[PDB]
């Protein structure tokens, strides 16, 4: 939901 790009 927020920025979950690693």
């Amino acid at each position: 939901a927020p920025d979950t790009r690693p």
Partner: single-chain antibody, 226 residues
């Protein structure tokens, strides 16, 4: 090393306007959402705004306190993020930081701006000693913290130096020491230091996500004695 560098702060009159800038290097800026967060002695850390990607039509969200007064924007060709602040109020006084990645790994040094409901609760203070295991907790007034709150943990050292430790509940940021870990325990988010070290004496903040905004806890002062 990633670098974020804010600029544009100053000493302004209420009703005034100011634009802050932040330039990023060392990571693929255009693939990450960017945030502004401010620190005041009165209100601790407060999330201000986010801006998402080109593929999201640069969607933005704002704290209720700044909505209609502030505008976040970015320029991917310059690896920069901006905060335009209009109709400044005394309560806007603070140190402003640009931050992002997984979700608050990286923080700039901050730029000072002097103008002249969900509650997230943390332990005010904890005392430990080197080699002990210490667990800090983060509670929401809404009920249970779950993986849908994407808990983050950030450390503040002197002088207003922030580094993200954990994002997405339990994911360590790159280069963060192995002794730090994140968990959910009894419906709270929790940061554990397994074998505390003297250099871990710091203030630790948690942040929780609620659909389209973040709410930071009040911070815990951790003292490491001996």
């Amino acid at each position: 090393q990633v670098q974020l560098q804010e600029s544009g702060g100053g000493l302004v009159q209420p009703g005034g306007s100011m634009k802050l800038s932040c330039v990023a290097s060392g990571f693929t800026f255009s693939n990450y959402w960017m945030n502004w967060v401010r620190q005041s002695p009165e209100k601790g850390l407060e999330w201000v705004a986010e801006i998402r990607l080109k593929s999201n039509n640069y969607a933005t969200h704002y704290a209720e306190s700044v909505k209609g007064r502030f505008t976040i924007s970015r320029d991917d060709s310059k690896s920069s993020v901006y905060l335009q602040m209009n109709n400044l109020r005394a309560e806007d006084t603070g140190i402003y930081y640009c931050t992002g990645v997984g979700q608050f790994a990286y923080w700039g040094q901050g730029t000072t701006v002097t103008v002249s409901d969900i509650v997230v609760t943390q332990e005010s203070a904890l005392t430990t000693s080197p080699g002990e295991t210490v667990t800090l907790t983060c509670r929401s007034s809404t009920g249970a913290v779950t993986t849908s709150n994407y808990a983050n943990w950030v450390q503040e050292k002197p002088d207003h130096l922030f580094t993200g430790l954990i994002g997405g509940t339990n994911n360590r940021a790159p280069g963060v020491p192995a002794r730090f870990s994140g968990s959910l325990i009894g419906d709270k988010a929790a940061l554990t230091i397994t074998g505390a070290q003297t250099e871990d004496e710091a203030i630790y903040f948690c942040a929780l996500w609620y659909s389209n905004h973040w709410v930071f806890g009040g911070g815990t002062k951790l003292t490491v004695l001996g």
